[PDB]
Ligand binder design. Structure first.
Ligand SMILES: *[C@@H]1O[C@H](CO)[C@@H](O[C@@H]2O[C@H](CO)[C@@H](O[C@@H]3O[C@H](CO)[C@@H](O)[C@H](O)[C@@H]3O)[C@H](O)[C@H]2NC(C)=O)[C@H](O)[C@H]1NC(C)=O
Ligand SMILES: *[C@@H]1O[C@H](CO)[C@@H](O[C@@H]2O[C@H](CO)[C@@H](O[C@@H]3O[C@H](CO)[C@@H](O)[C@H](O)[C@@H]3O)[C@H](O)[C@H]2NC(C)=O)[C@H](O)[C@H]1NC(C)=O
Ligand SMILES: *[C@@H]1O[C@H](CO)[C@@H](O[C@@H]2O[C@H](CO)[C@@H](O[C@@H]3O[C@H](CO)[C@@H](O)[C@H](O)[C@@H]3O)[C@H](O)[C@H]2NC(C)=O)[C@H](O)[C@H]1NC(C)=O
Ligand SMILES: *[C@@H]1O[C@H](CO)[C@@H](O)[C@H](O)[C@H]1NC(C)=O
Ligand SMILES: *[C@@H]1O[C@H](CO)[C@@H](O)[C@H](O)[C@H]1NC(C)=O
Ligand SMILES: *[C@@H]1O[C@H](CO)[C@@H](O)[C@H](O)[C@H]1NC(C)=O
Ligand SMILES: *[C@@H]1O[C@H](CO)[C@@H](O)[C@H](O)[C@H]1NC(C)=O
Ligand SMILES: *[C@@H]1O[C@H](CO)[C@@H](O)[C@H](O)[C@H]1NC(C)=O
Ligand SMILES: *[C@@H]1O[C@H](CO)[C@@H](O)[C@H](O)[C@H]1NC(C)=O
Ligand SMILES: *[C@@H]1O[C@H](CO)[C@@H](O)[C@H](O)[C@H]1NC(C)=O
Ligand SMILES: *[C@@H]1O[C@H](CO)[C@@H](O)[C@H](O)[C@H]1NC(C)=O
Ligand SMILES: *[C@@H]1O[C@H](CO)[C@@H](O)[C@H](O)[C@H]1NC(C)=O
Ligand SMILES: *[C@@H]1O[C@H](CO)[C@@H](O)[C@H](O)[C@H]1NC(C)=O
Ligand SMILES: *[C@@H]1O[C@H](CO)[C@@H](O)[C@H](O)[C@H]1NC(C)=O
Ligand SMILES: *[C@@H]1O[C@H](CO)[C@@H](O)[C@H](O)[C@H]1NC(C)=O
Lengths: 175, 328, 328, 175, 328, 175
């Protein structure tokens, strides 16, 4: 969509992630593994419920209207009765068709957005200690055990704690 | 901040999003089939096939038309003083009394259907010099030749038929619907037998309107043994006004008034079975749920209903784009 | 570029956006109450309660209906040859002349209201063998029994009402509206007194149409001492055509024609006071400004007006999201 | 909204900023201060005025139409007169409701966009001399007096002038 | 990996997008003139000026109205049993037979135009005691005084016009359209000469309806030497029903029935030339292509057509914003 | 538009680029050159064709309708015939006007998006070897001959190959 995260710089989705919509999958000293992100999953889910409820809002009720089926041939007034209803129907059908089109387009960019926002939020947190590998993965340039990985995920990672270690083997001139 | 570490290694963190193996196709502004994780249908397209008898008052007409119920065809005597939110007319309804026609039947059917009450009040009309309660062999009420319960056929007394001139004020505070008619005989012999004058006349008026109908003598197709017809007309008399009926022949007089009201009532042609359940939205095909914003079941609806649309499916993506690994 | 410094320090630069302490709630695609810095109302919902007399020509009908003004009821003689962009009919308007009814009153009221001119031209009709200028006690013009100024009641002279057959060509280059009628007597005695023939007839025709009305004798409710009625009819005669009026009784003859025109004129029922001000959009509730795209004052409108909508408020966010430091 | 600057990485707004919509706040060895940004404020304001005028564009005028109030019961033709107008009204009400909804949604993302664009523009200007603190604030790694702060704000900051100073105490290995 | 290079240099890579020197202005949500690289028009605004004779069956009426073609005015005898998807009526069409008028002409023109067939079936009506095949000098068929080919004028036989009472069942399985009429004489002399009875009557009925028309005597404007008129009426008789025509004067009898059908046929007034080409969308101004979604040529259309819109240009940007470096 | 690449951080377009919509210009040891990018050009073109076809989708056909021109003055029924059609027309004209407006707005942000996405994709590929000059140009900090420029453009650039060279004269402290 507009941001190019989903079906973009993130080559594909994870059928394996059954606990949330967006998430992290890490590899580190203490093994490997993944974890769903719940705040972005909720942000995406709430927005979609929000548009959904607004679409499903009040049905207008109508009682006595005009007749819409005729069993006799009458001419002018009946021709006008059929025309008023046929132009009403085509106008509401146009409306329902444009509505889901705009709506769907926006749901795909909104969820593209949330993916990209998690990406950027994680990027900002790691400060000078990681590099983008351009496929949605950061390379963290310092020893990051599972508690370190958990602090990135729960937003408490202190980059200063690792800046010297990181910076040093990040700018490792020798190869 | 910390001391020089004796170890040196990196870690990898990848962000991503889920994908499902199933996945639904949805239309977009730029694509008309794009696959998303999940979607929801916005077009209701199926009915139970039953008209739920709740919350609206459905009155099944069984084999009576609303106009026959109104006029009082013997076989519809059940509907006398009945009331409804929706009158259902059945395709198998039939009339079985004197052959009549209603010039602008369609508006009479509308404004009765719309006030939703058949409550009738007999008024003391006094017809002097004519014979009341005429009836016929084509409108048998029970083992007897009879007529529409709400109309009073008038013929000659002994040798003559006078110029009827009667009045009936609306002294109430509601409008009164009066239904009356005129008898068109088959032959001039029939005309004179019943009404003496060779040419009858009915004039029905109030302070603000008048109707004068002259009968029309001639043979029509035989229906129920008769080639004569009665035509039905209606007059609303507002509070404070006066009905004056004046005739020197062929009058089918009113026996009083239907009272009108304003409400949410209508009429619907449907052969759907009424069943005991609760549904707000009624379609001739039976009730339909009104959770979805649009429906494709039927353009005729009564009650809180989805907007009829031409489309039969319209999926709202309620999830991101589905970009799977290995597919299934 | 420059040389090694002695001081070493950093600075902090933060970007941000304003917030307001007040802030308005607005609907969105995904939320229906989200707070923004500022918004503007798009539904106009209040009128001054006065119809501004500018820029359209408002003609206040005072206690005259447009049809009575047209026919020339004595009390409406003021409107003679008057003109309008909007004719305002008042709820307290009353008629006060011979009791008439107009079969399809609603179209006559429309096409007069729409041409916006009551300019009348008297034509020299010559009625030979009848008495002109009949009038009545229920249509007193001043201290005199009179009739509608634009119609000419004709009765017999002696015991002859001849067969009137008159013609009047349209030799101009504009259509001519002619208004005529027929008198329905209460009794056959009245009929013969006035028109001799026991059954009158009026046929009014042009090259492309004809109307034949037969009168209807009978008592109607007493209004202004009378139980008779006149019914009003209209004929437009196009340039180059011919009116032919032919009758042997009950003709209420035309005195000439109203001329028709095409314009932006209409009629409106309103009891609002006309005042001196300028407003383009008129509602029965008075004028309303037309800065906003939509209005909720009234569905009846005349002039440059906002589109009527069901909603009474519809706020367009004209500012960013309000995210204040403390709260709202 | 879609970019996640307003009510996103920028925790909240400034009720104190009365001179513009977007702006700058700083802390240098001389002191503190804030200053509105006028170009992004105008960009946001013009766009909003633009959509506003288009909405407020030409009223269509209508003169003689159909009657819309009746005092007598007539049946078929009057039922059609009431139906034509009731379906016209519900169609225009749908239109006004969808219009402000799309419009409002777009005004919130457009202003989110302008905030994020100022952020990115400032980011690009500071080149290697500053770091993102992830809350909308850059840490400038060199002495930046009020004239230096003003050159960032008026777009004339020369990053080369400070690159060596910056880079040196930026990659300060010792802690 | 590799060995040290003695050179030390950088490279510059700039990304960018094209721009065009031409460029089109387009409306947006926030701007109403913004320049883009390219755009495409969505409002069709020009016709060829010719009605293409493909794929719909166009039937040019030449100088005949559909009602005259139906009734069988001599000069329209060509259209006998003709068929169409679109009947084109020409402004120069003229009638040239007995002067008639059709009460509710507009519905008769509609329901014939809509069934799209003028196929007529003669039925064996037997009129006993009257003279068939009356004709007139104003409806010359060839060198002979004649009448409408599909109607049968009836006058008395010798000294009496009996009471015609005839029947004709619909035993087929399709509806039958019957067209009949009544003759309104100019004078009572004319009336009695032709029909003996001083007052004729026509009653045409089926099991479910009836029409009784009484003629109207009086002079109308002279058209084609005549001041009399015939008025045309129509009766549809459904399968299994019965037509009964009963009259004692002034009947213009039917010679059988037009058969009705359901289809996509219509009628259009246009003086555009029909030409041989294929176009699906027809406008009174000639055909128009239907590639664009909207058109501004004309609100009257027949066939697969663009939606008529008030706008005459509506450009869809099909390219990015045009930001040229020099300009041109 | 919303992303600020086109008519934003990229000062202007290139009338000279006749072989594609988006593209690269460069200067390297081997000389100067430009080259269109075909994948982003196709992404932008396909999306625009997609919306275009959907707009140009099925025309509804109508046959016998009501009359829309009258030559006689009739009053009430004709007034209703003229009103049904006039309200139909104003409703379809509103629809066509809002449609191209929404559509056009989205085409300009969609193409702004594709420009910015190419920019970001190139940025990610160059990893630590280049710097943004903030005008859409990267300064590549190592010798990049025409085959090196071609590998950036065809997505095969290996940043490790040049990381030491790059990093060294990138953090060249002396000035
Ligand atoms: C005028 O013409 C009509 C039609 O030609 C005549 O109508 C027919 O009248 C006869 C005589 O009563 C009807 O006969 C009855 O038919 C029923 C059903 O088949 C049968 O059971 C009875 O025993 C009797 O035969 C016939 O149905 C009726 N048909 C129609 C279509 O109306 C009418 O009598 C004529 N009137 C005069 C006064 O000339
Ligand atoms: C036919 O029947 C109607 C209604 O029964 C008769 O109408 C009534 O006629 C009387 C006699 O003129 C009217 O009386 C007058 O009433 C006015 C108003 O109250 C008053 O000013 C007079 O002093 C006198 O009382 C009465 O109003 C009128 N009422 C109605 C409702 O029309 C009519 O006379 C009968 N006609 C014949 C020829 O039998
Ligand atoms: C009733 O009044 C009408 C109108 O005043 C009379 O109509 C006119 O009748 C005369 C006599 O036939 C027509 O004259 C004819 O004119 C044509 C064309 O100029 C000419 O070719 C004929 O040979 C003859 O001279 C005249 O056209 C006609 N005009 C109109 C407008 O209808 C009618 O005769 C009167 N009828 C009676 C019975 O009093
Ligand atoms: C975040 O994770 C770390 C590492 O497990 C834990 O100690 C810390 O308390 C967590 N903080 C929050 C707010 O979840
Ligand atoms: C799909 O979306 C609908 C509407 O939000 C929801 O009821 C349903 O649970 C969703 N399906 C899944 C598998 O989440
Ligand atoms: C109908 O209701 C009225 C009003 O109370 C009553 O007088 C009348 O007798 C009722 N008739 C029947 C058959 O219920
Ligand atoms: C509803 O009934 C109509 C006929 O009244 C039929 O044509 C239509 O297909 C039905 N639709 C459904 C979903 O039952
Ligand atoms: C709110 O928006 C409207 C429309 O743009 C404008 O007239 C008004 O000045 C704005 N309010 C403030 C406080 O800026
Ligand atoms: C009405 O206008 C006509 C046209 O000039 C004029 O002849 C006539 O006398 C006028 N009548 C009145 C009362 O103004
Ligand atoms: C306008 O007048 C109508 C009655 O004509 C009334 O129901 C409506 O509430 C009024 N609205 C306003 C805003 O005055
Ligand atoms: C920007 O600010 C600096 C520092 O005060 C000043 O010298 C310079 O002239 C300003 N330039 C512009 C274009 O405002
Ligand atoms: C402009 O757009 C239309 C529709 O996409 C296309 O047919 C045409 O080729 C385009 N023009 C150019 C110069 O590409
Ligand atoms: C019209 O068609 C019918 C049906 O076959 C036929 O009997 C009749 O003779 C035809 N008449 C002409 C003039 O074609
Ligand atoms: C089409 O014809 C109508 C008259 O029928 C005319 O007013 C209109 O301007 C014409 N338009 C074009 C594009 O020919
Ligand atoms: C990319 O360009 C390089 C340098 O010319 C070339 O060797 C390589 O094969 C190209 N790869 C692809 C996939 O185009």
């Amino acid at each position: 969509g507009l941001f190019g995260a989903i079906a973009g710089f993130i080559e594909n989705g994870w059928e394996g992630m059954i606990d949330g919509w967006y998430g992290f999958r890490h590899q580190n000293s203490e093994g490997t593994g993944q974890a769903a992100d719940l705040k972005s999953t909720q942000a995406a889910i709430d927005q979609i419920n929000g548009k959904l409820n607004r679409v499903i809002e009040k049905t207008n009720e109508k009682f006595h209207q005009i007749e819409k089926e005729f069993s006799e041939v009458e001419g002018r007034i009946q021709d006008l009765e059929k025309y008023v209803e046929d132009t009403k129907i085509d106008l509401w059908s146009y409306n329902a068709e444009l509505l889901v089109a705009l709506e769907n387009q926006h749901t795909i960019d909104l969820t593209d957005s949330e993916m990209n926002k998690l990406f950027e939020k994680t990027r900002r947190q790691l400060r000078e200690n990681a590099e983008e590998m351009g496929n949605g993965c950061f390379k963290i340039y310092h020893k990051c055990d599972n508690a370190c990985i958990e602090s990135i995920r729960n937003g408490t990672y202190d980059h200063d704690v690792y800046r010297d270690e990181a910076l040093n083997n990040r700018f490792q001139i020798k190869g | 901040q910390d001391l020089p570490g004796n170890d040196n290694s990196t870690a990898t963190l990848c962000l991503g999003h889920h994908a499902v193996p199933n996945g639904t196709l949805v239309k977009t502004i730029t694509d008309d089939q794009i696959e998303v994780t999940n979607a929801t249908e916005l077009v209701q397209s199926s009915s139970t096939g039953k008209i739920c008898n709740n919350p609206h008052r459905i009155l099944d007409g069984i084999d009576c038309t609303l106009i026959d119920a109104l006029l009082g065809d013997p076989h519809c005597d059940v509907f006398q003083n009945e009331t409804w939110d929706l009158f259902v007319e059945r395709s198998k309804a039939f009339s079985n009394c004197y052959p009549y026609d209603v010039p602008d039947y369609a508006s009479l059917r509308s404004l009765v259907a719309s006030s939703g009450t058949l409550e009738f009040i007999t008024e003391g009309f006094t017809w002097t010099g004519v014979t009341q309660n005429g009836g016929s062999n084509a409108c048998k009420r029970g083992p007897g030749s009879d007529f529409f319960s709400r109309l009073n056929w008038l013929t000659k007394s002994g040798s003559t038929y006078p110029v009827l001139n009667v009045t009936m004020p609306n002294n109430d505070n509601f409008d009164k619907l009066y239904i009356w008619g005129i008898h068109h005989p088959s032959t001039n012999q029939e005309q004179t037998s019943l009404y003496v004058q060779a040419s009858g006349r009915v004039t029905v008026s109030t302070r603000r309107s008048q109707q004068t109908i002259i009968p029309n003598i001639g043979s029509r197709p035989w229906v129920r043994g008769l080639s004569s017809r009665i035509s039905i007309y209606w007059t609303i008399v507002k509070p404070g006004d006066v009905l004056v009926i004046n005739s020197n022949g062929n009058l089918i007089a009113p026996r009083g008034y239907f009272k009108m009201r304003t409400g949410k009532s209508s009429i619907m042609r449907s052969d759907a079975p009424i069943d005991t359940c609760i549904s707000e939205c009624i379609t001739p095909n039976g009730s339909i749920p009104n959770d979805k914003p649009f429906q494709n079941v039927n353009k005729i609806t009564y009650g809180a209903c989805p907007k009829y649309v031409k489309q039969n499916t319209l999926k709202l993506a309620t999830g991101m784009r589905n970009v799977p690994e290995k597919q299934t």
